[PDB]
Design a protein around this motif. Structure first.
Motif, PDB file in Angstrom:
ATOM      1  N   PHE B  34      20.514  26.087  30.126  1.00 50.30           N
ATOM      2  CA  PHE B  34      19.562  27.227  29.595  1.00 50.30           C
ATOM      3  C   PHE B  34      19.914  27.134  28.327  1.00 50.30           C
ATOM      4  O   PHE B  34      18.770  27.611  27.583  1.00 50.30           O
ATOM      5  CB  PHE B  34      19.677  28.305  30.657  1.00 50.30           C
ATOM      6  CG  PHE B  34      18.934  28.355  31.915  1.00 50.30           C
ATOM      7  CD1 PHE B  34      17.647  27.917  31.990  1.00 50.30           C
ATOM      8  CD2 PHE B  34      19.522  28.334  33.189  1.00 50.30           C
ATOM      9  CE1 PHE B  34      16.981  27.711  33.034  1.00 50.30           C
ATOM     10  CE2 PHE B  34      19.082  28.153  34.492  1.00 50.30           C
ATOM     11  CZ  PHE B  34      17.449  27.678  34.332  1.00 50.30           C
ATOM     12  N   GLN B  35      21.202  27.267  27.595  1.00 51.00           N
ATOM     13  CA  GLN B  35      21.391  27.154  26.212  1.00 51.00           C
ATOM     14  C   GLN B  35      20.724  25.973  25.795  1.00 51.00           C
ATOM     15  O   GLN B  35      19.998  26.116  24.650  1.00 51.00           O
ATOM     16  CB  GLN B  35      22.922  27.212  26.081  1.00 51.00           C
ATOM     17  CG  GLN B  35      23.357  27.124  24.810  1.00 51.00           C
ATOM     18  CD  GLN B  35      22.949  28.397  23.789  1.00 51.00           C
ATOM     19  OE1 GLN B  35      22.818  29.497  24.441  1.00 51.00           O
ATOM     20  NE2 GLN B  35      22.690  27.966  22.495  1.00 51.00           N
ATOM     21  N   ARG B  36      20.641  24.970  26.093  1.00 51.25           N
ATOM     22  CA  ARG B  36      20.305  23.950  25.282  1.00 51.25           C
ATOM     23  C   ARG B  36      18.552  23.829  25.446  1.00 51.25           C
ATOM     24  O   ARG B  36      17.800  23.548  24.681  1.00 51.25           O
ATOM     25  CB  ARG B  36      20.212  22.435  26.038  1.00 51.25           C
ATOM     26  CG  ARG B  36      19.752  21.326  25.536  1.00 51.25           C
ATOM     27  CD  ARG B  36      20.444  19.919  25.981  1.00 51.25           C
ATOM     28  NE  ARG B  36      19.921  19.638  27.290  1.00 51.25           N
ATOM     29  CZ  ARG B  36      19.073  18.970  27.570  1.00 51.25           C
ATOM     30  NH1 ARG B  36      18.092  18.624  26.991  1.00 51.25           N
ATOM     31  NH2 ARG B  36      19.068  18.726  29.109  1.00 51.25           N
ATOM     32  N   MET B  37      17.834  24.509  26.756  1.00 55.25           N
ATOM     33  CA  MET B  37      16.517  24.806  26.828  1.00 55.25           C
ATOM     34  C   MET B  37      16.085  25.679  25.609  1.00 55.25           C
ATOM     35  O   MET B  37      15.048  25.468  25.130  1.00 55.25           O
ATOM     36  CB  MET B  37      16.123  25.254  28.085  1.00 55.25           C
ATOM     37  CG  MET B  37      14.796  25.067  28.558  1.00 55.25           C
ATOM     38  SD  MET B  37      14.443  26.123  30.140  1.00 55.25           S
ATOM     39  CE  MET B  37      15.386  24.761  31.129  1.00 55.25           C
ATOM     40  N   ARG B  38      17.180  26.730  25.388  1.00 52.67           N
ATOM     41  CA  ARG B  38      16.777  27.923  24.265  1.00 52.67           C
ATOM     42  C   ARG B  38      16.606  27.152  22.956  1.00 52.67           C
ATOM     43  O   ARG B  38      15.709  27.289  22.255  1.00 52.67           O
ATOM     44  CB  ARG B  38      17.825  28.880  24.318  1.00 52.67           C
ATOM     45  CG  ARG B  38      17.538  29.940  24.972  1.00 52.67           C
ATOM     46  CD  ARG B  38      18.250  31.092  24.513  1.00 52.67           C
ATOM     47  NE  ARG B  38      18.602  32.149  25.918  1.00 52.67           N
ATOM     48  CZ  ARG B  38      17.722  33.119  26.032  1.00 52.67           C
ATOM     49  NH1 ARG B  38      16.849  33.566  25.076  1.00 52.67           N
ATOM     50  NH2 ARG B  38      17.796  33.989  26.917  1.00 52.67           N
TER      51      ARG B  38
END
Ligand SMILES: C[C@]1(Cc2cn(-c3ccc(F)cc3)nn2)NC(=O)CC1=O
Ligand SMILES: C[C@]1(Cc2cn(-c3ccc(F)cc3)nn2)NC(=O)CC1=O
Ligand SMILES: C[C@]1(Cc2cn(-c3ccc(F)cc3)nn2)NC(=O)CC1=O
Ligand SMILES: C[C@]1(Cc2cn(-c3ccc(F)cc3)nn2)NC(=O)CC1=O
Ligand SMILES: [Zn+2]
Ligand SMILES: [Zn+2]
Ligand SMILES: [Zn+2]
Ligand SMILES: [Zn+2]
Lengths: 197, 197
Positions: B34-38
């Motif tokens: 979810f960090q990389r998606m953000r």
């Protein structure tokens, strides 16, 4: 890469919903329904049913037209084919009997897409999107079609039914409210490229 | 009335499943995912993912090929498109990276059918078969395609994955086991006329 079917949707306010005489179901109960299914299977084999999915939008939010029997069960327009009856001619016939106009002007039903198949293995409520293991004689085959509506239309709704426009979010994961066929329409309609006219 | 797509299925025993080096995920955890998606959303906008549904049969019972990460999560072969990358060329590329052969002989992937679309409204697990109300900037769009297999093929499975052939009955109403996308494949595949070769 554009491998999607393109479907025109029109606003719910483009359609007129008139009224006509009640249309009564053959079966007065679940028990009669399964009795008649048993009797006909012995005479003519597997029941063939066809159902139409009619889509509209308001403010770009797709809605499926459902028929509510008073305030009870939600159904798609459709029903039982006669023996040797073509599936598409049969759905057209059934949608004319249900929503066709009192002035006897013909609706121009356009049916170009199968969106699924359900199979009833026993004289019992359970239906599956496949023929289950060990089942050679399914008792019913239900075929769902996408019905492309014209820009404008007048529909005559039998007085004992309400025509409700259900948004996809209300159907989604709501088998208790709508059952396993209507509740999976969001997944079945996701492949379509809807144009919001 | 034959409005169905006809798809050739072949026996699972027609296919050879070889092995190759492990293929590691970019994200070492849900939190990193979810960090990389953000981070990428801020740079290049909505994530575009593509997934292939590969079907076989044994004794006329259709099965979907799934990739199991050891004994953990089940996934479809597929993954993330690069910016400006064609969806179909991209799924072909990703399925070659995942199941393509060590001897570098090209698989002839045939992709002619979109079978659905899923949308992730937030940097969170929930995905829907529609863009939910109030959501203007979905964070991911996932597109599913039916991949028609050749009669015979050799697939090289990364050593850290198992290729499992899942019958439709096992997927059906099994979101806990497979999640909402794989668990709805039976409904999504029901419209196809499968030929059991
Ligand atoms: C199939 C049919 C006739 C019929 C009833 N309806 C209907 C009305 C509203 C609706 F939403 C869905 C179906 N359509 N056709 N059903 C019977 O019980 C006898 C019979 O042959
Ligand atoms: C309902 C009405 C009058 C009427 C309405 N429309 C119409 C409206 C909207 C549309 F999209 C297409 C036609 N045409 N005729 N009176 C009757 O006795 C039956 C009948 O026809
Ligand atoms: C999309 C991709 C690369 C990748 C991994 N897999 C994979 C393997 C097996 C499987 F069943 C499904 C997907 N395919 N492509 N995923 C990442 O974490 C980085 C990245 O770009
Ligand atoms: C795995 C093998 C030998 C092989 C098998 N097949 C084959 C089998 C089934 C089929 F459907 C299509 C081809 N061809 N070559 N040895 C290597 O080092 C890679 C490689 O190719
Ligand atoms: Zn509007
Ligand atoms: Zn059948
Ligand atoms: Zn066999
Ligand atoms: Zn999108």
């Amino acid at each position: 890469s554009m491998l999607e079917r393109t479907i025109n949707l029109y606003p719910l306010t483009n359609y007129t919903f008139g009224t006509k005489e009640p249309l009564y179901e053959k079966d007065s109960s679940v028990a009669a329904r399964f009795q008649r299914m048993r009797e006909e299977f012995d005479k003519i084999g597997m029941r063939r049913t066809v159902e139409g999915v009619l889509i509209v939008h308001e403010h770009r939010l797709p809605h499926v037209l459902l028929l509510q029997l008073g305030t009870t069960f939600f159904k798609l327009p459709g029903g039982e084919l006669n023996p040797g009856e073509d599936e598409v001619e049969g759905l057209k016939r059934l949608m004319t009997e249900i929503l066709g106009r009192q002035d006897g002007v013909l609706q121009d039903w356009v049916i170009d897409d199968c969106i699924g198949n359900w199979w009833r293995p026993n004289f019992e409520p359970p239906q599956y999107p496949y023929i289950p293991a060990h089942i050679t004689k399914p008792k019913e085959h239900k075929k769902l079609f996408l019905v492309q509506l014209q820009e404008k239309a007048l529909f005559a709704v039998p007085k004992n039914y309400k025509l409700v426009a259900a948004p996809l979010f209300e159907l989604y994961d709501n088998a208790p409210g709508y059952g396993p066929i209507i509740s999976s329409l969001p997944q079945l309609l996701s492949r379509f490229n809807f144009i919001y006219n």
